Amino acid sequence: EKKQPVDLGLLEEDDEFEEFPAEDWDAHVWEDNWDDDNVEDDFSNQLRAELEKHGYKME
Amino acid sequence: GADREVQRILLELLNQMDGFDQNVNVKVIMATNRADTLDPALLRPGRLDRKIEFPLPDRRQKRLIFSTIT
Amino acid sequence: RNDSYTLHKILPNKVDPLVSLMMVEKVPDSTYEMIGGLDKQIKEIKEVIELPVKHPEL
Amino acid sequence: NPDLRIAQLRFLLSLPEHRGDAAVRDELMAAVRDNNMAPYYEALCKSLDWQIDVDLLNKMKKANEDELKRLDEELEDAEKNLGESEIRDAMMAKAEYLCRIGDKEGALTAFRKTYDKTVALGHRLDIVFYLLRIGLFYMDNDLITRNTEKAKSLIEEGGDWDRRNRLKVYQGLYCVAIRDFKQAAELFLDTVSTFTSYELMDYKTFVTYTVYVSMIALERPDLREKVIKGAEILEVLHSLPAVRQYLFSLYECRYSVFFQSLAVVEQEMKKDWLFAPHYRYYVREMRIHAYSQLLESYRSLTLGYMAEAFGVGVEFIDQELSRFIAAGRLHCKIDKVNEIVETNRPDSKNWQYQETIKKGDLLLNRVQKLSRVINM
């Protein structure tokens, strides 16, 4: 059955990136997920919240 | 052939005495003046823990007893 | 077997008497790690009991 | 022990870099020397990518061989002169020594076999505590969940409330190590009454954590009840000058400042490990609360009022709320034409419904998945 699966996989592809991924092949997961997104915002905001208000100080 | 019946009665008390579960909200209250002819098997941490004494009053107590009676 | 008064089957356990006596005594089941200030003794005890048993060949 | 601090400083070195090549690294190395550690030196070098002095490694390994030799020998003498409670102890020094040598599998096995002995409670329990300790040290997870269950049983049977408190400190700190702050709230927050477990960290650190998580996941009247009015905090929360300043700023409706201290502490979290990348989850949330708390008394209020309060420009403020509104995490809605904001209250059902369906789906996906497996 495993062999059959493998065969199927082979047919579907090879593959280029898939091979690389396999080669690379860890870690955990923690608990739950979504949505990460970007970062360096909060302080950036404050950096701007200053600047903003500093601009508003400039105002 | 009379003792046999009692002993068990003790063992009965004994068995269901500690057989509970720690959760069984059931307290045991035993009253006796001659706190002496009591198999120690009774007064063991678990079956009979708190041991309480009832003095023959004195001065103060009597005042409460007297005042309460009168 | 009730009326046949032959063994129908052999039930499990018997209950032991010595165990029953021990239960009736109820003497705290105490593990070491709970008595500080009683080593020298313990050592002695070990010497007079533990060692004597562990390796009576000693 | 093994002393966590090694791990914390290690993580510190990992940081976004930051290099540096400051206190940290040489602090670590300094505690390699006196700790003749090894499994790091290759583990760390392979991680950080900066090895050197093949000689030092050899010296450390040598001395290690010396003492492992010695403890092995000691144990040998016991086998002929046991000494039940003794043997297990020399073992505790063995696997323990693996802790000083910070090798996981080794102390693991060593401890295990010591359980077959142990017999008592402090050895069969507290030893476990250390075994998991390693867990905290490596940054694992399961390795702990399975042992906190063990100790859980050992404590559920008998034991006392002295071990249960450390226990709740570990479990708690763990809960923080994930996104599970709610569970850490009560756990840690209740850990202030007692805290003999300085093994991990000090008392004021812990304090900052329990106050942090408290502020995060406690309600407003139970914040005032269990933290703002913390007899053990007042004497400590006066010892600090950051989280507290924020906590008060909230509770008392002094927003605009609250923000600044919030950013500050955020810039203090990314340094820790218990949060690591949670510094992004914490602040996100702490943004919402205030926005929430600000509106709750208004059926309508004007942006410039808010922006003015917090002391930011409108456009940025609008931009912020836009994050939380569509997610139904905030019951506001905005009108930009007139610069106004009105608040639509939510229905209880609407809350659960969204939560119930989410939970039900998670169970369904797991049910089916493993269904097919057992089906074939």
From Swiss-Prot, chain A:
Major localization listed first in the record, in broad terms: nucleus
The UniProt record lists the keyword Ion transport: no
Superkingdom assignment: Eukaryota
Subcellular location: Nucleus
Disulfide-linked positions: none
Organs and tissues of expression: Expressed in limb bud, craniofacial primordia and skin.
Oligomeric and partner information: Component of the 19S proteasome regulatory particle complex. The 26S proteasome consists of a 20S core particle (CP) and two 19S regulatory subunits (RP). The regulatory particle is made of a lid composed of 9 subunits including SEM1, a base containing 6 ATPases and few additional components. Belongs to the TREX-2 complex (transcription and export complex 2), composed of at least ENY2, GANP, PCID2, SEM1, and either centrin CETN2 or CETN3. Component of the homologous recombination repair (HR) complex composed of ERCC5/XPG, BRCA2, PALB2, DSS1 and RAD51. Interacts with the C-terminal of BRCA2.
Functional note: Component of the 26S proteasome, a multiprotein complex involved in the ATP-dependent degradation of ubiquitinated proteins. This complex plays a key role in the maintenance of protein homeostasis by removing misfolded or damaged proteins, which could impair cellular functions, and by removing proteins whose functions are no longer required. Therefore, the proteasome participates in numerous cellular processes, including cell cycle progression, apoptosis, or DNA damage repair.
Protein name in UniProt: 26S proteasome complex subunit SEM1
Curated annotation (Swiss-Prot), chain B:
Name of the protein: 26S proteasome regulatory subunit 6B
UniProt similarity note: Belongs to the AAA ATPase family.
Assembly: Component of the 19S proteasome regulatory particle complex. The 26S proteasome consists of a 20S core particle (CP) and two 19S regulatory subunits (RP). The regulatory particle is made of a lid composed of 9 subunits, a base containing 6 ATPases including PSMC4 and few additional components. Interacts with NR1I3. Interacts with PAAF1. Interacts with TRIM5. Interacts with ZFAND1.
Domain of life per record: Eukaryota
Residues of the whole record sequence present: 280 to 349 of 418
Function: Component of the 26S proteasome, a multiprotein complex involved in the ATP-dependent degradation of ubiquitinated proteins. This complex plays a key role in the maintenance of protein homeostasis by removing misfolded or damaged proteins, which could impair cellular functions, and by removing proteins whose functions are no longer required. Therefore, the proteasome participates in numerous cellular processes, including cell cycle progression, apoptosis, or DNA damage repair.
Localization, UniProt: Cytoplasm; Nucleus
Lineage of source species: Eukaryota, Metazoa, Chordata, Craniata, Vertebrata
Protein source organism: Homo sapiens (Human)
UniProtKB/Swiss-Prot annotation, chain C:
Localization in the cell: Cytoplasm; Nucleus
TM stretches of this protein: none
Entry-annotated residues carrying Phosphoserine: S4
Record-stated family: Belongs to the AAA ATPase family.
Annotated function: Component of the 26S proteasome, a multiprotein complex involved in the ATP-dependent degradation of ubiquitinated proteins. This complex plays a key role in the maintenance of protein homeostasis by removing misfolded or damaged proteins, which could impair cellular functions, and by removing proteins whose functions are no longer required. Therefore, the proteasome participates in numerous cellular processes, including cell cycle progression, apoptosis, or DNA damage repair.
UniProt subunit comment: Component of the 19S proteasome regulatory particle complex. The 26S proteasome consists of a 20S core particle (CP) and two 19S regulatory subunits (RP). The regulatory particle is made of a lid composed of 9 subunits, a base containing 6 ATPases including PSMC5 and few additional components. Component of a complex with USP49 and RUVBL1. Interacts with PRPF19. Interacts with TRIM5. Interacts with NDC80. Interacts with PAAF1. Interacts, in vitro, with the thyroid hormone receptor (in a thyroid hormone T3-dependent manner) and with retinoid X receptor (RXR). Interacts with ERCC6.
Name of the featured protein: 26S proteasome regulatory subunit 8
Organism, as annotated: Homo sapiens (Human)
Organism lineage string: Eukaryota, Metazoa, Chordata, Craniata, Vertebrata
Gene: PSMC5
Whole sequence portion shown: 117 to 174 of 406
Curated annotation (Swiss-Prot), chain D:
Cellular component GO terms, alphabetical: cytosol; extracellular region; ficolin-1-rich granule lumen; nucleoplasm; proteasome accessory complex; proteasome complex; proteasome regulatory particle; secretory granule lumen
Cross-referenced SUPFAM superfamilies: TPR-like, Winged helix' DNA-binding domain
Annotated Pfam families: PCI (PF01399), RPN7 (PF10602), RPN7_PSMD6_C (PF21154)
Domain PCI: 180-348
Gene Ontology biological-process entries: proteasome-mediated ubiquitin-dependent protein catabolic process
Keywords annotated in UniProt: Proteasome
Organism domain of life: Eukaryota
Family listed: Belongs to the proteasome subunit S10 family.
PANTHER family reported for this sequence: 26S PROTEASOME NON-ATPASE REGULATORY SUBUNIT 6, 26S PROTESOME SUBUNIT 6
Its biological purpose: Component of the 26S proteasome, a multiprotein complex involved in the ATP-dependent degradation of ubiquitinated proteins. This complex plays a key role in the maintenance of protein homeostasis by removing misfolded or damaged proteins, which could impair cellular functions, and by removing proteins whose functions are no longer required. Therefore, the proteasome participates in numerous cellular processes, including cell cycle progression, apoptosis, or DNA damage repair.
Identification of the protein by name: 26S proteasome non-ATPase regulatory subunit 6
Organism of this sequence: Homo sapiens
Lineage, uppermost ranks: Eukaryota, Metazoa, Chordata, Craniata, Vertebrata
Gene (name only): PSMD6
